[PDB]
Amino acid sequence: DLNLNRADYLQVGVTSQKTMKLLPARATQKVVVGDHDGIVMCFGMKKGEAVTVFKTLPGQKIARLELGGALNTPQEKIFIAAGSEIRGFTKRGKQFLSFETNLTESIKAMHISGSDLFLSASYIYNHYCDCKDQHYYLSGDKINDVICLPVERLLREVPVLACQDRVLRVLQGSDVTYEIEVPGPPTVLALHNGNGGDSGEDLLFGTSDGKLGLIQITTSKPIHKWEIRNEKKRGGILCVDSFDIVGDGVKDLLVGRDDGMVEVYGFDNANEPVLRFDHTLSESVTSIQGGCVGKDGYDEIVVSTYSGWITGLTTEPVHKESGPGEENQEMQNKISSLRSELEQLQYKVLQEREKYQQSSPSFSVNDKFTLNKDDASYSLILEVQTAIDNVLIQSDKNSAVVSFSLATYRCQANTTRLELKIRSIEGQYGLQAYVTPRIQPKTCQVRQYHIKPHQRTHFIDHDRPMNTLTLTGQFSFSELHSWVVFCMPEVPEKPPAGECVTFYFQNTFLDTQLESTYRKGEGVFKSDNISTISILKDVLSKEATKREINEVSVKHTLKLIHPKLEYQLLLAKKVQLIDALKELQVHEGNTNFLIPEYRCILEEADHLQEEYKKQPAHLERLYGMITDLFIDKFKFKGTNVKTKVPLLLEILDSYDQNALIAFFDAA
Amino acid sequence: QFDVEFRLAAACRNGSIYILRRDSKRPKYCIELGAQPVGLVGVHKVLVVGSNQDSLHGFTYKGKRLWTVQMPAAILAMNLLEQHS
Amino acid sequence: EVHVLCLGLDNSGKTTIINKLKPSNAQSQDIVPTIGFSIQKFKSSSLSFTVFDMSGQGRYRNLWEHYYKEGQAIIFVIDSSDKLRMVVAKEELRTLLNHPDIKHRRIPILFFANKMDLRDALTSVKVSQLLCLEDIKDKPWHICASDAIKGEGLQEGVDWLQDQI
């Protein structure tokens, strides 16, 4: 039980991930933030108003900001990395360090351990020591964050490198010692205290699927301690921090999300976490810190919001004064200030609109085209700094209305983010989205996502019936890799070095692996499904024109499918009688008469009825998958059986599984 | 039966409360209930008992139910915190 | 001159306000028990006003019922950490003000809350506005501005209470 009041502070421009920090300063600390235009600023919030300090000049988009100190001195040097170089400010507007670190594209993460500087890139990772290159690594996948264990509480510097493919490569020097496996692509990670864990060293990670962990990286192996795998708390962890807000004596875990959710985890079990307070914010949190910034003497949480609203959650009540008829006076002060500002701004912008109309805007959309694993549906999430007016969805929690015509979605009132599901079949590769904000010229920005023709994992099971398939002849390995990127959801674009790469995929609708190995001129695409290899054959032949069977595999796939169809049919059969039995329920109180069989349905009627709403889509998808399986497994032998479909449809209306397999093997 | 001169109080199955004092002293047995009094409770001057039919039980050592009903449902175990005689 | 009385809830120990409500010359670092009968001059939100002090044990909350009738000005306080011992402080105004002596004079009559830096609280007014007791209207005041021990908010209902004298 805990309550935090939402007190708002200065608003800055749109911010990236982990772009807010608190200067350690017993009184109120200072907040420092970085806008996407380069204007790094800092304030102190003396009394209600932000007393700005060294609001610098605009430049490149501030991709990361971190405060550190050379020796055990109180860390105060704030380093940013805007376009390709790391700039550094003291606790005032004096720039002292400007390391050019000439690179190709940009920086996406950086860590300052005194003089040691561990920076990331798209794929590259560098470790400098005072503008001197000392370590250089090139992962095969994009890096999300880099950290180094405390070089003081331990002796060796072991930088950890979080890759996009669900691994943490805990490398030393310029080569990986070992790799820890984690569920979901890691996005944030920070040692879980002001030191890095009492019992030596501990690394706390948070992934983009929504998952926390405490990988304890020893010299040669990790020691998993706990995990906060969630069910309802979906949303990419963009920030996490450690601070004792509850006041019990042990530091708590302040964790942010991508759907606004801010959570505090207490360790009252003395070893394991437990949720204590959660709060939604209507935007995407990008940075979280503890301490106090307003009215020293009360611990609070500072939360950087995507659009820039640097909000705080305080432990101090807001109703300080309560006399007579009343409705506080700070509300009246803020009201009057906003009144005056909006009057004068209306004057100016009306005159400028007149001048512009008589003489007659780029923005950012933090989109996230992820793939839900518990379902088979991508969950697209658009975000804009301002509010949206309408979103087109052209193809080849939400409060919006449908845009159906090609879906047009209008967003009611003043909403920034929009989450919409998209369910695509195992085939049908080929999706645009026009976003329009509520600004005056009312422009529109288009995004082009791809629905690929399988969530990638790290291991398969070779004891399954593998329906191998071999491509040979006249390839540049980069080109074959480009084909596989065209064909597979989660693969890095840059061709991995070594001219020989192997990936271990997995179908999410039902567990069937798709091991894919390939060299400079040869490729083996093993599988557990006939549909997967048929689709691969067709799409790869199409790409080329642009530029074996285990006789038991069908049995295995049908045995996989059977439980799902059985469950759907039982769903239908029970929901057919739910309401008829409910009509009998309302009389004679059900004391002695109802059969136990239907009595098992009278309780779970609610869940049955709410699953029946989604049933027909699953049934249609299963019928389509079965008919594609049948057609393809007859197509490999060289036949064309596009005509026997209606008999299969009738059989599935009956669904005699043994008669089904008989019709499969016979005709 | 906390009397300061040690007059013990006992409760009957029938719900009739007896006033059997030290060495089985003879005192009038109060029947001060309508339902079963299975709710006796010490009060720091007297012996609190609870009425069976959703009625608060108040009483002193001479039969007289000091308190009026104060409980909506059937209580099960009273107590009392700290103040004097 | 203008006195001030405060009582408080039982089983708390919430009586430590009058020391930090006193001046800076003689501030006390020990916890100040609400013994009552205090005699001092303290510069308040209107002028250098006077005070009075009492103890609230249920067994003991009757010496405050022995000094309840009098007082130049008045005083409001409560225990806003009490989730069970604040049912009993509801009747305390009807003990205090309902009495005839308090009702007769239009001086200062307000009840305020406390224990804000403690990890539970309620409405600012608390005594006359949170626990359904908004009906203190004919009493010629209102009370506000409460913290726990850090020393805030004694000038909060002051226009209704302190500067109203």
Side-chain angles (χ1 to χ4, degrees), chain A residues 7 13 24-25 27 34 38 44 48 50 58-59 63 68-70 74 81-83 88 93 109 114 121 140 150 159 162 173 183-186 190 194 196-197 200 206 210 213 222 235-236 247 249 256 260 266 270 273 290-291 294 297 308 312 317 323-325 361 376 387 400 407 413 427 430 433 437 441 453 465 473 489 492 495-498 521 523 544 549-667, chain B residues 9-11 15 27 34-35 37 39 42 50 58 63 72-74 77, chain C residues 8 13 23 26 33 36 56 58 71 73 89 100 108 113 121 140 145 148 151 153 157:
Chain A
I549 287 175
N550 282 24
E551 313 286 350
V552 77
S553 81
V554 189
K555 266 67 68 183
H556 177 51
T557 67
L558 289 177
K559 184 161 300 178
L560 282 176
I561 276 176
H562 162 255
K564 307 199 171 194
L565 267 170
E566 186 194 39
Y567 197 67
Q568 297 309 311
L569 297 201
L570 269 294
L571 200 47
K573 191 179 305 190
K574 300 168 187 177
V575 299
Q576 271 193 15
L577 314 178
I578 278 179
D579 52 354
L581 298 159
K582 258 303 188 175
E583 282 190 356
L584 275 70
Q585 165 80 319
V586 69
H587 325 277
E588 65 262 7
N590 178 29
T591 44
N592 51 336
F593 74 103
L594 262 183
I595 180 174
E597 161 65 75
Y598 298 151
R599 268 211 286 205
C600 314
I601 311 304
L602 264 293
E603 301 108 7
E604 200 192 18
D606 46 0
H607 314 116
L608 271 289
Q609 181 58 227
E610 56 82 20
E611 291 154 32
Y612 191 43
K613 320 169 167 177
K614 322 180 313 169
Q615 162 183 317
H618 305 325
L619 266 172
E620 161 64 27
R621 185 58 83 84
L622 276 180
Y623 287 161
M625 195 164 63
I626 279 181
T627 198
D628 295 303
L629 194 46
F630 172 93
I631 293 176
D632 296 313
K633 75 103 171 180
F634 278 167
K635 184 192 177 185
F636 283 171
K637 303 167 190 178
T639 78
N640 190 328
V641 193
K642 293 286 292 297
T643 79
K644 274 77 177 177
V645 193
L647 308 95
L648 192 157
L649 312 178
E650 212 283 338
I651 292 168
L652 271 291
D653 308 311
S654 75
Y655 190 59
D656 179 326
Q657 191 270 330
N658 309 279
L660 188 45
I661 190 170
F663 183 85
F664 268 100
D665 58 58

PDB file of all heavy atoms in Angstrom, chain C residues 106-121, unseen atoms left out:
ATOM      1  N   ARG C 106     -17.949  33.840  20.479  1.00  0.00           N
ATOM      2  CA  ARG C 106     -17.423  33.850  19.115  1.00  0.00           C
ATOM      3  C   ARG C 106     -15.945  34.222  19.152  1.00  0.00           C
ATOM      4  O   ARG C 106     -15.551  35.372  18.968  1.00  0.00           O
ATOM      5  CB  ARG C 106     -18.226  34.810  18.244  1.00  0.00           C
ATOM      6  N   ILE C 107     -15.124  33.215  19.428  1.00  0.00           N
ATOM      7  CA  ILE C 107     -13.679  33.381  19.489  1.00  0.00           C
ATOM      8  C   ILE C 107     -13.066  32.460  18.447  1.00  0.00           C
ATOM      9  O   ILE C 107     -13.487  32.471  17.289  1.00  0.00           O
ATOM     10  CB  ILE C 107     -13.121  33.027  20.878  1.00  0.00           C
ATOM     11  N   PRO C 108     -12.068  31.656  18.852  1.00  0.00           N
ATOM     12  CA  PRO C 108     -11.539  30.776  17.807  1.00  0.00           C
ATOM     13  C   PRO C 108     -11.889  29.314  18.060  1.00  0.00           C
ATOM     14  O   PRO C 108     -11.453  28.726  19.050  1.00  0.00           O
ATOM     15  CB  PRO C 108     -10.026  30.982  17.918  1.00  0.00           C
ATOM     16  N   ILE C 109     -12.643  28.703  17.150  1.00  0.00           N
ATOM     17  CA  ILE C 109     -13.032  27.302  17.322  1.00  0.00           C
ATOM     18  C   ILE C 109     -12.832  26.431  16.078  1.00  0.00           C
ATOM     19  O   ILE C 109     -13.718  26.339  15.230  1.00  0.00           O
ATOM     20  CB  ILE C 109     -14.499  27.182  17.777  1.00  0.00           C
ATOM     21  N   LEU C 110     -11.666  25.797  15.974  1.00  0.00           N
ATOM     22  CA  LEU C 110     -11.369  24.922  14.840  1.00  0.00           C
ATOM     23  C   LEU C 110     -10.554  23.686  15.236  1.00  0.00           C
ATOM     24  O   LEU C 110      -9.796  23.717  16.205  1.00  0.00           O
ATOM     25  CB  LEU C 110     -10.640  25.702  13.744  1.00  0.00           C
ATOM     26  N   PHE C 111     -10.716  22.601  14.481  1.00  0.00           N
ATOM     27  CA  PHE C 111      -9.980  21.361  14.726  1.00  0.00           C
ATOM     28  C   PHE C 111      -9.146  21.019  13.494  1.00  0.00           C
ATOM     29  O   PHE C 111      -9.673  20.962  12.384  1.00  0.00           O
ATOM     30  CB  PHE C 111     -10.942  20.218  15.047  1.00  0.00           C
ATOM     31  N   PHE C 112      -7.849  20.791  13.684  1.00  0.00           N
ATOM     32  CA  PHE C 112      -6.955  20.493  12.561  1.00  0.00           C
ATOM     33  C   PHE C 112      -6.369  19.084  12.596  1.00  0.00           C
ATOM     34  O   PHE C 112      -6.431  18.401  13.619  1.00  0.00           O
ATOM     35  CB  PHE C 112      -5.827  21.525  12.495  1.00  0.00           C
ATOM     36  N   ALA C 113      -5.799  18.654  11.471  1.00  0.00           N
ATOM     37  CA  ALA C 113      -5.214  17.322  11.382  1.00  0.00           C
ATOM     38  C   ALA C 113      -3.713  17.369  11.652  1.00  0.00           C
ATOM     39  O   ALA C 113      -3.151  18.431  11.934  1.00  0.00           O
ATOM     40  CB  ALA C 113      -5.469  16.695  10.006  1.00  0.00           C
ATOM     41  N   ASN C 114      -3.070  16.208  11.557  1.00  0.00           N
ATOM     42  CA  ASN C 114      -1.668  16.058  11.945  1.00  0.00           C
ATOM     43  C   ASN C 114      -1.080  14.855  11.216  1.00  0.00           C
ATOM     44  O   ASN C 114      -1.744  14.230  10.383  1.00  0.00           O
ATOM     45  CB  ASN C 114      -1.544  15.920  13.467  1.00  0.00           C
ATOM     46  N   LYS C 115       0.197  14.572  11.503  1.00  0.00           N
ATOM     47  CA  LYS C 115       0.902  13.348  11.096  1.00  0.00           C
ATOM     48  C   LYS C 115       1.004  13.198   9.574  1.00  0.00           C
ATOM     49  O   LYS C 115       0.819  12.111   9.023  1.00  0.00           O
ATOM     50  CB  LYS C 115       0.258  12.111  11.727  1.00  0.00           C
ATOM     51  N   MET C 116       1.325  14.298   8.890  1.00  0.00           N
ATOM     52  CA  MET C 116       1.374  14.252   7.433  1.00  0.00           C
ATOM     53  C   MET C 116       2.638  13.574   6.924  1.00  0.00           C
ATOM     54  O   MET C 116       2.583  12.826   5.943  1.00  0.00           O
ATOM     55  CB  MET C 116       1.263  15.655   6.846  1.00  0.00           C
ATOM     56  N   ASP C 117       3.785  13.814   7.567  1.00  0.00           N
ATOM     57  CA  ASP C 117       5.003  13.109   7.181  1.00  0.00           C
ATOM     58  C   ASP C 117       4.983  11.647   7.601  1.00  0.00           C
ATOM     59  O   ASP C 117       5.809  10.868   7.114  1.00  0.00           O
ATOM     60  CB  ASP C 117       6.237  13.794   7.765  1.00  0.00           C
ATOM     61  N   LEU C 118       4.072  11.267   8.493  1.00  0.00           N
ATOM     62  CA  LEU C 118       3.764   9.866   8.701  1.00  0.00           C
ATOM     63  C   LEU C 118       3.076   9.306   7.462  1.00  0.00           C
ATOM     64  O   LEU C 118       2.478  10.032   6.667  1.00  0.00           O
ATOM     65  CB  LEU C 118       2.875   9.685   9.926  1.00  0.00           C
ATOM     66  N   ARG C 119       3.125   7.988   7.326  1.00  0.00           N
ATOM     67  CA  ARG C 119       2.748   7.328   6.087  1.00  0.00           C
ATOM     68  C   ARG C 119       1.256   7.071   5.974  1.00  0.00           C
ATOM     69  O   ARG C 119       0.857   6.156   5.246  1.00  0.00           O
ATOM     70  CB  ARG C 119       3.514   6.014   5.943  1.00  0.00           C
ATOM     71  N   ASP C 120       0.425   7.830   6.685  1.00  0.00           N
ATOM     72  CA  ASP C 120      -1.009   7.847   6.450  1.00  0.00           C
ATOM     73  C   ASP C 120      -1.540   9.215   6.847  1.00  0.00           C
ATOM     74  O   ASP C 120      -1.013   9.858   7.756  1.00  0.00           O
ATOM     75  CB  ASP C 120      -1.729   6.740   7.228  1.00  0.00           C
ATOM     76  N   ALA C 121      -2.578   9.657   6.146  1.00  0.00           N
ATOM     77  CA  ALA C 121      -3.220  10.944   6.400  1.00  0.00           C
ATOM     78  C   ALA C 121      -4.637  10.895   5.824  1.00  0.00           C
ATOM     79  O   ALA C 121      -5.146   9.823   5.479  1.00  0.00           O
ATOM     80  CB  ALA C 121      -2.402  12.102   5.814  1.00  0.00           C
TER      81      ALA C 121
END
